[PDB]
Amino acid sequence: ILCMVFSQDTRMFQGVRGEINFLNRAGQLLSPMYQLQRYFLNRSNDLFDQWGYEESPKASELHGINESMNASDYTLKGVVVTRNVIDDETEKVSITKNLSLIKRTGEVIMGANDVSELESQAQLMITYDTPKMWEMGTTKELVQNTYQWVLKNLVTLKAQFLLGKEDMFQWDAFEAFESIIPQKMAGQYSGFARAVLKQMRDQEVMKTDQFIKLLPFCFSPPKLRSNGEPYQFLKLVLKGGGENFIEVRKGSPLFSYNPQTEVLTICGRMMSLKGKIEDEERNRSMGNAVLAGFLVSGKYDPDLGDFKTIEELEKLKPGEKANILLYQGKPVKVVKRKR
Amino acid sequence: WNTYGPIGDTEGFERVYESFFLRKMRLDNATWGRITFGPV
Amino acid sequence: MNINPYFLFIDVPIQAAISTTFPYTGVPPYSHGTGTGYTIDTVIRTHEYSNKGKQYISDVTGCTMVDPTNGPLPEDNEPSAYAQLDCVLEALDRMDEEHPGLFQAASQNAMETLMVTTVDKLTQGRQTFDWTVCRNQPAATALNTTITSFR
Amino acid sequence: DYRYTYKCHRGDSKVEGKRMKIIKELWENTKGRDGLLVADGGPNIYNLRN
Amino acid sequence: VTGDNTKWNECLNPRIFLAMTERITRDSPIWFRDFCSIAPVLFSNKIARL
Amino acid sequence: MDTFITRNFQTTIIQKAKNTMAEFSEDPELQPAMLFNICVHLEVCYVISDMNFLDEEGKAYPQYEVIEGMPRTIAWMVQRSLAQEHGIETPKYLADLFDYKTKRFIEVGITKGLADDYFWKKKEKLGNSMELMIFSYNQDYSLSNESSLDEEGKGRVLSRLTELQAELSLKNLWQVLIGEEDVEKGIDFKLGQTISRLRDISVPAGFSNFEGMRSYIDNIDPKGAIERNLARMSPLVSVTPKKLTWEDLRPIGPHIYNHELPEVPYNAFLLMSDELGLANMTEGKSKKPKTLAKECLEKYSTLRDQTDPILIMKSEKANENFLWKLWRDCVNTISNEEMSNELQKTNYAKWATGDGLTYQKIMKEVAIDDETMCQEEPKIPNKCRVAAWVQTEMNLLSTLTSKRALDLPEIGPDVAPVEHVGSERRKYFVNEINYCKASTVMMKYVLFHTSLLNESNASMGKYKVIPITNRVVNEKGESFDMLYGLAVKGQSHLRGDTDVVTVVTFEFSSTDPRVDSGKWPKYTVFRIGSLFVSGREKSVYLYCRVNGTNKIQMKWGMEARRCLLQSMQQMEAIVEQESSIQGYDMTKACFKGDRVNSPKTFSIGTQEGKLVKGSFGKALRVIFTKCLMHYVFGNAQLEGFSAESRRLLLLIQALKDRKGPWVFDLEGMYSGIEECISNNPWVIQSAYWFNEWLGFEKEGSKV
Amino acid sequence: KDEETCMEGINDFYRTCKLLGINMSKKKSYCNETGMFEFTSMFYRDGFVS
């Protein structure tokens, strides 16, 4: 079939019935020859019927073949079988931008569309280091890898963050992580993360757990409201729905923290953060790193009322105090701040 | 029982239910190809 | 903007558009009641399309019997149960001639299966009308009751 | 529907139940959390190929 | 033609089914012929319960 | 056993026996004894037909034709041809072997005891119309004719069968060896006098006894009978073919446009577009419905403490006072402390739902004697015109709200390309219809019906209060527990599942019924209080309605979650058609658009009488809303109308594709369709939309 | 050859099935050029099937 397609026989051209608008993985139109190749590979009966048959040669070893490779007198024109097997040393070749091999004189020897699409699983547990390709793995694996990368070099991230520039939200790991963030909410996620990190930096309540949790989301360009105030969220959802969500206040299956033992749980894997945690970090428990423009000022006061939803928090005015809930049994009292 | 029950010995379990393990092994060693829609 | 779901048919072939119209292949709960009235209507209609046949009195059960076969051919497009025997026999002859050795082989296979089968096969079925109590009972219970009565 | 009927929600979920306490303890004590059955609050892995 | 049949089961006659069974089993043991015929004759005398 | 079969016989023999026995239409595995018997028989007959040969005159140096092993059809036709060519009677049983010399069919058999009895009983079975040779494992032989087999064949067969017998007992297989007569035990079937009479009286007109019918069938040659019968048949028996045309199609059920008829009422179980949930933000824990309702009423304490009702509208028969007192009792029970949700003031509950007005059943004898007891006429459904509220229902239920109520579990990682395509389709579908109001309404419906079904577990003779609650999630992630009202379910003393158990439902709403008086001819509505959302007062009405449904209706409501799968299947069929036009998947291209393609757009509806297009997401939302409404508004009329509109739509499609459709009885189809348009709001609106779309197609086909 | 002869054949088939007791539904049947039709709740259309 590939021989028909490559020979450019007019019969092969006439043997096309349906549309051949096939697309490649990159989304770019295939070359016409490869389009016909793919169409006929998926459609073999049409070309075989259109080609026309003829009588097989009378030689002993030469015999014809049908559509289903059955020996017969009626054989595809110009096609014959032979028992006289024909027998089946290295050079260097240059490459170009489009991953196409071009010989010394310039002829193309191997294109990027000749790669068989036969997906399979390697028999050995291969490993890769580059984060640009983490997207191939599942969402949980991507989250685990990006958080491992953030944690291992946490010292450099903290050092650059204390400087206050913007070059530390564009690391390759963050670009890889952005893929699993829904497009519609990516801007709000990034804006909220940047606002909360800036608020934490300004007034020293630096919490390692919140910093690690909310650092990856800061890539995407900020998307603020018409009021110029950053959005507010309770939990940030990721692609895949359901379990794939990071809780901003208490903890999620993808991310949890145990301050009693100072243990970080990422996608069911446990690690120790000894040496990366300050003594005073525990005292400033959670309330200063859960909302933008809000800081803790007191404790649960039933008189002020029940807990206030994000809808009322967003419409609140500066200088007004409200009550929020971190998790079951740990309420807190916060106050809006201009800064 | 699944949490703190006695821990038995499962040696030779694959042999007893060998057909299912063979099916799983065949599935794992698959080489998926393309997907082609109706002729029309 | 008043939605019009049927407008989908403009942009999609109707064969695909109306795909899976009814999620249920079984029976709804609101179907017209199948009680004494419905069965009476069914028997009335069954006897109505065959009322031009031969009406007689069964000498075994003493019940009215209607036989439309080989009856007068219809003169109107209304439903008719008058099936001539000759036409059916000719159609069977044509089928047998087209498929030689088909009826014989099928009959032989059926008789062999019947010879090798067992009474338990009757238990694979839906509700069965038990005559001892004159009700609807599971297949196994009906078979057991019939066997006990026979014993 | 299966999880609702058998009260076998995920071991890492925040739901409460008579069976869910033991499920949560087993999930905490287990290392191979991908190998736990769904009936024991583990993760479902069923898909078309399997 | 995407034909449909109205009153399909209210028009077919058990006698015609008996004729079909007799024609099909024209070359078969007599006992099997009777066994096949016992069903159509039973149906031809069916009594409905209201 | 099977190991012995595959070891003692060549693969060809085993395959022939297996494929010949598999025609029995039964499992060949659980019963391999007959497989061994058939294999041995095949070997015996193969051996019998491998030593003797004939010639142009009959020199003994073939003579035996093998019939067994070959397909039953081919074997039977070959046997019939041999009988016809040799001018001999055809045995009624398929002979396993034929002889050219004796010009007779022959049969072979294998036994375990003496062969004399087996031969005699086979002779009784087949009479004298077939010859036979029989051999037994215990060195016994029987031949009808001594000039049939020679010494060599008999000796070889005897040696083979003796070897098989000896080898069987080595592996404990002779014990489980079944005989041969068992498969043919039943050969005697004598009909009794009664059954014979029934058969005789069950012949077509023209025959006296079944013997005449049998002879007529077995003798007469009916060739050419069809033409003779058709020639004299009246010409009036004609389908009357008629080529269809665009002008032939006309609007269906024009009476719906008759302004004289009343508007279609709102007969849905629960309010869909007019719902009003008393939001109460919660952490996410699961709590009993009674506690959730209690907390929700506590938050909106003003509505709970309302004791003076400002009646706004009343039903034709229902009593406002009784309904209000029942609602007060329900709220009192909800606000109490006892765990049970059981009403204790059964007075108003009993007297409000008309549960005491049921007729008393008396003995049939009195009714027969009585003259005033007569059957009542059937209350055929009334006829109603187009209802304007169904259009608003469809419009609003297809909108995107600020909350979603779907949280499905996870699935294993996708590897195969088909899994990736399915996952992409699921992602697009859920993203499109996650927040659609139809999804929330569907979840409320299914949850309420599930709670109703559960409450009928053990409480059947008692009144049960059930809050119409829902669990919802918004974009920000905070989740709310909405309460849409209450409903008290009465008792069903009868144990039947198809028996109506009256339930009266009080649902909150924010829409004044006076705006559309015709939308609520069946509801009793009060005014409880007023909520504040943005500092603005909005009234709250309590629609109270009596209803009757059975356990099967509860099951139907529970299954009403199948609308999700239905809509997904419809969307997948659309995508599959689009991809079948091409050779590759069209999911992302038809949703987002690739370089080659463009985002597919669907004609959604009408705006000021002009067509309007929209994204595939809007089409998906409309499909989901249509499926949900079809499930909610489902009755026999709806399913019948859909089944007949199927044929009408198919004919319209055939017209569109220039296939030249022909109709035989068009008015029959139109009558069948119009027979179902009586009072269902969904059916009437579907007829209206079908007429509009048919007009659009007519006006657009002339281009 | 032409649709007229096709409809004559359809009429002959209708009469024939009438002779055998099979009653075709004129109120639920239609005819169209081959390539698109239905068979037991399965719509076929130029290769596509639903």
Place of tokens 């497989």: F35
Q: What are phi and psi of F659, to 5 degrees?
A: -95, 0
Touch between C and B (at least 3 CB pairs under 8 Å): no
Of C15, C77, C91, the CB nearest to G20: C91
- E4–G contact, CB cutoff 8 A: yes
Contacts of F418 in chain D (CB under 8 A): 48
Q: What are phi and psi of A320, to 5 degrees?
A: -110, 135
Residue F257 gets which letter from DSSP? G
Element (H, E) at F143: strand F140-143
Residue A333 gets which letter from DSSP? E
Q: How many CA atoms does the CB half-sphere of F245 hold within 13 Å? A: 5
Instruction: Tell me how far CA of residue F409 lies from CA of A242, A268, F282, F412, in angstroms.
Output: 6, 18, 21, 10
Contacts of G31 in chain F (CB under 8 A): 241, 661-664
Q: F240 vs G10: CB contact, 8 Å cut-off?
A: no
- Rounded CA separation F324/F643 (Å): 43
* Binding-site entries of F for Mn(2+): 41, 68, 96, 107-108
DSSP for F582-635? SSS--HHHHHT--SSS---EEEEEEETTEEEEEEHHHHHHHHHHHHHHHHHT--
Residue F263 gets which letter from DSSP? P
First-to-last C-alpha distance (Å) of chain E? 37
Torsion angle, CA of F161/F163/F165/F168, rounded to 10 degrees? -130
Element (H, E) at A297: strand A294-298
- Rounded CA separation F496/A309 (Å): 47
Residue type, A212: I
Residue F276, both tokens: 């009003």
Residue A30 gets which letter from DSSP? P
From the candidates A235, A307, A327, which should be mutated to test the interface with F, based on the most F CB atoms within 10 A?
A235
Touch between D and C (at least 3 CB pairs under 8 Å): no
Residue C55 gets which letter from DSSP? E
Contact F75, F65 (CB under 8 A): no
Of A18, A234, A242, the CB nearest to F407: A242
- Please list, residue by residue across A225-248, b when 16 or more beta carbons sit within 10 angstroms of its beta carbon and e when fewer do: eeeeebbbbbbbbbebbebbbbbb
- Residue ranges with strand state E in F274-331: 281-282
Bridge partners, F131 (sequence order):
F106
Breaks (C-N over 2.5 A) in chain A follow: 88
Cβ neighbours around A1 below 10 Å, total: 13
Task: Name the residue of chain B whose CA is nearest to G35's CA.
Answer: B40
Q: Name residues whose C-beta falls within 8 Å of residue C7's C-beta, 6 or more positions apart in sequence.
A: F602, F603, F604, F605, F606, F611, F693, F696
Residue F9 gets which letter from DSSP? S
Torsion angle, CA of F661/F662/F667/F668, rounded to 10 degrees? -100
Pairing of the two strands F131-136 and F104-111: parallel
Contact F306, F528 (CB under 8 A): yes
Residue type, F551: K
- F408–B contact, CB cutoff 8 A: no
Contacts of F430 in chain A (CB under 8 A): 241
Largest Cα–Cα distance in chain D?
35
Contacts of A243 in chain D (CB under 8 A): 10, 12
Contact F483, F292 (CB under 8 A): yes
Q: Name residues whose C-beta falls within 8 Å of residue F288's C-beta, 6 or more positions apart in sequence.
A: none
- Rounded CA separation G14/G24 (Å): 7
Residue A249, both tokens: 């206040």
Q: Nearest to residue A80, comparing CAs of A106, A104, A54, A116? A: A54
Contact F424, F539 (CB under 8 A): no
Residue type, G18: K
G24: left (phi over 0), alpha (psi -120 to 50) or beta: beta
- Between helix F417-433 and helix F563-581 the angle, nearest 10°, is 120
Q: A42 vs F583: CB contact, 8 Å cut-off?
A: yes
Q: Helix H segments across G1-50?
A: 3-19
- Rounded CA separation B7/E48 (Å): 64
- E16–F contact, CB cutoff 8 A: yes
* Binding-site entries of G for Mg(2+): 38
Chain C: list its partners (3+ Cβ pairs within 8 Å).
E, F, G
Touch between A and D (at least 3 CB pairs under 8 Å): yes
Cβ neighbours around F147 below 10 Å, total: 8
First-to-last C-alpha distance (Å) of chain F? 75
Radius of gyration of chain A (CA): 32
- Rounded CA separation B39/F181 (Å): 55
Torsion C40-C46-C51-C56 (CA) sign = negative
Q: How many CA atoms does the CB half-sphere of F210 hold within 13 Å? A: 19
- Rounded CA separation F398/F393 (Å): 9
> What is the number of H-type helices and E-type strands within chain A?
10, 14
- Rounded CA separation C78/A259 (Å): 86
Pairing of the two strands F64-66 and F242-243: unpaired
Residue G6, both tokens: 């096709």
Cβ neighbours around F232 below 10 Å, total: 7
Place of tokens 């809050």: F467
- Between helix F225-232 and helix G3-19 the angle, nearest 10°, is 100
Residue type, B5: G
Q: What are phi and psi of A252, to 5 degrees?
A: -130, 160
- Rounded CA separation F237/F239 (Å): 7
Q: Name residues whose C-beta falls within 8 Å of residue F692's C-beta, 6 or more positions apart in sequence.
A: C4, C6, F606
Residue F303, both tokens: 């509505």
In Å, how far is A261's CA from the nearest CA of chain F? Answer: 26
- Rounded CA separation F212/F221 (Å): 15
Q: Nearest to residue F208, comparing CAs of F216, F200, F218? A: F200
- Rounded CA separation D13/D9 (Å): 7
- Rounded CA separation F18/F13 (Å): 8
Instruction: Tell me how far CA of residue A309 lies from CA of A315, F94, F361, in angstroms.
Output: 10, 86, 58
Contact F594, F646 (CB under 8 A): no
Q: Helix H segments across chain A?
A: 2-7, 10-14, 32-42, 45-51, 139-152, 154-163, 172-178, 183-202, 208-214, 310-314
Q: How many CA atoms does the CB half-sphere of E37 hold within 13 Å? A: 30
∠ Cα F538 F539 F542 (to 5°): 145
- F417–B contact, CB cutoff 8 A: yes
Contact F110, F37 (CB under 8 A): yes
Contacts of B24 in chain F (CB under 8 A): none
DSSP for F468-479? EEEEEEETTS-E
Q: Nearest to residue F474, comparing CAs of F403, F374, F371? A: F403
Contacts of A18 in chain B (CB under 8 A): 39-40
Contact F406, F624 (CB under 8 A): no
Q: B33 vs A42: CB contact, 8 Å cut-off?
A: no
Task: Name the residue of chain G whose CA is nearest to B39's CA.
Answer: G47
- Rounded CA separation A64/A45 (Å): 17
Q: Is A18 exposed, middle or buried (0-12, 13-18, 19+ CB in 10 A)?
A: middle
Q: Is B14 exposed, middle or buried (0-12, 13-18, 19+ CB in 10 A)?
A: exposed
Contact E7, C74 (CB under 8 A): no
Q: Kindly report the length of chain D.
A: 50
3-state SS of A72-115 is CCEEECCCCECCCCCCCCCCCCEECCCCCEECCCCCEEECCCCC
- Between helix F563-581 and helix F437-455 the angle, nearest 10°, is 140
Residue E40, both tokens: 């159509």
Element (H, E) at F229: helix F225-232
Radius of gyration of chain F (CA): 39
Residue A31, both tokens: 């070359």
Contacts of B3 in chain D (CB under 8 A): 22, 25-26, 29
Q: Name residues whose C-beta falls within 8 Å of residue F690's C-beta, 6 or more positions apart in sequence.
A: C6, F252, F645, F648
- Residue ranges with strand state E in F219-365: 242-243, 281-282
- B2–D contact, CB cutoff 8 A: yes
Residue A43, both tokens: 């459609």
- Rounded CA separation F256/F624 (Å): 26
Place of tokens 């409450």: F455
Q: Helix H segments across F88-175?
A: 115-126, 151-168
Torsion A307-A309-A312-A318 (CA) sign = positive
| DSSP SS3 for C99 | coil
Element (H, E) at F403: strand F403-404
Torsion angle, CA of G43/G47/G48/G50, rounded to 10 degrees? 30
- E1–C contact, CB cutoff 8 A: no
F139: left (phi over 0), alpha (psi -120 to 50) or beta: left
Residue type, F518: G
3-state SS of F396-414 is HHCCECCEECCCCCCCCCC
Touch between B and E (at least 3 CB pairs under 8 Å): no
Q: C61 vs E23: CB contact, 8 Å cut-off?
A: no
Q: What are phi and psi of A39, to 5 degrees?
A: -60, -45
3-state SS of D1-50 is CHHHHHCCCCCCCCCCCHHHHHHHHHHHHCCCCCCCCHHHCCCCCCCCCC
In Å, how far is E11's CA from the nearest CA of chain G? Answer: 6
Element (H, E) at F484: strand F479-489
In Å, how far is G29's CA from the nearest CA of chain B? Answer: 25
Cβ neighbours around C77 below 10 Å, total: 18
- Rounded CA separation F432/F424 (Å): 12
Cross-sheet strand order for the sheet of G43-45:
G36-38, G43-45, G48-49
Place of tokens 């029309």: B40
Q: Nearest to residue C46, comparing CAs of C24, C20, C26, C66? A: C66
From the candidates F408, F415, F451, F564, which should be mutated to test the interface with D, based on the most D CB atoms within 10 A?
F415
Contact F490, F499 (CB under 8 A): no
Breaks (C-N over 2.5 A) in chain D follow: none
Instruction: Tell me how far CA of residue F637 lies from CA of F135, F151, F641, in angstroms.
Output: 71, 81, 6
Q: Nearest to residue A72, comparing CAs of A64, A61, A60, A82? A: A64
- G26–C contact, CB cutoff 8 A: yes
Contacts of G19 in chain F (CB under 8 A): 226, 229-230, 233
Q: What are phi and psi of F414, to 5 degrees?
A: -90, 135
Residue F38, both tokens: 């058939």
Q: What are phi and psi of A42, to 5 degrees?
A: -75, -20
Element (H, E) at F41: helix F33-48
Q: Nearest to residue A169, comparing CAs of A148, A198, A142, A136? A: A198
Q: Nearest to residue F625, comparing CAs of F433, F471, F444, F472? A: F433
- C95–E contact, CB cutoff 8 A: no
| DSSP SS3 for C3 | strand
The separation between CA F374 and the C-alpha centre of its own chain, rounded to angstroms, equals 39
First-to-last C-alpha distance (Å) of chain G? 31
Experimental method: cryo-EM
Contacts of G21 in chain E (CB under 8 A): 11-13, 16
> What is the number of H-type helices and E-type strands within chain B?
2, 1
Contact E4, G25 (CB under 8 A): yes
| DSSP SS3 for F663 | strand
Q: Nearest to residue F265, comparing CAs of F142, F129, F389? A: F389
- Rounded CA separation A56/A46 (Å): 21
Q: Residues C136-141: contacts with CB within 8 Å, 24+ apart?
A: none
Contact F274, F519 (CB under 8 A): no
* Binding-site entries of F for Mg(2+): 41, 68, 96, 107-108
Residue A327, both tokens: 């998790």
- A253–D contact, CB cutoff 8 A: yes
- Rounded CA separation A324/A304 (Å): 11
Residue F534, both tokens: 């943005």
∠ Cα F285 F286 F287 (to 5°): 115
Residue type, F549: T
Element (H, E) at A283: none
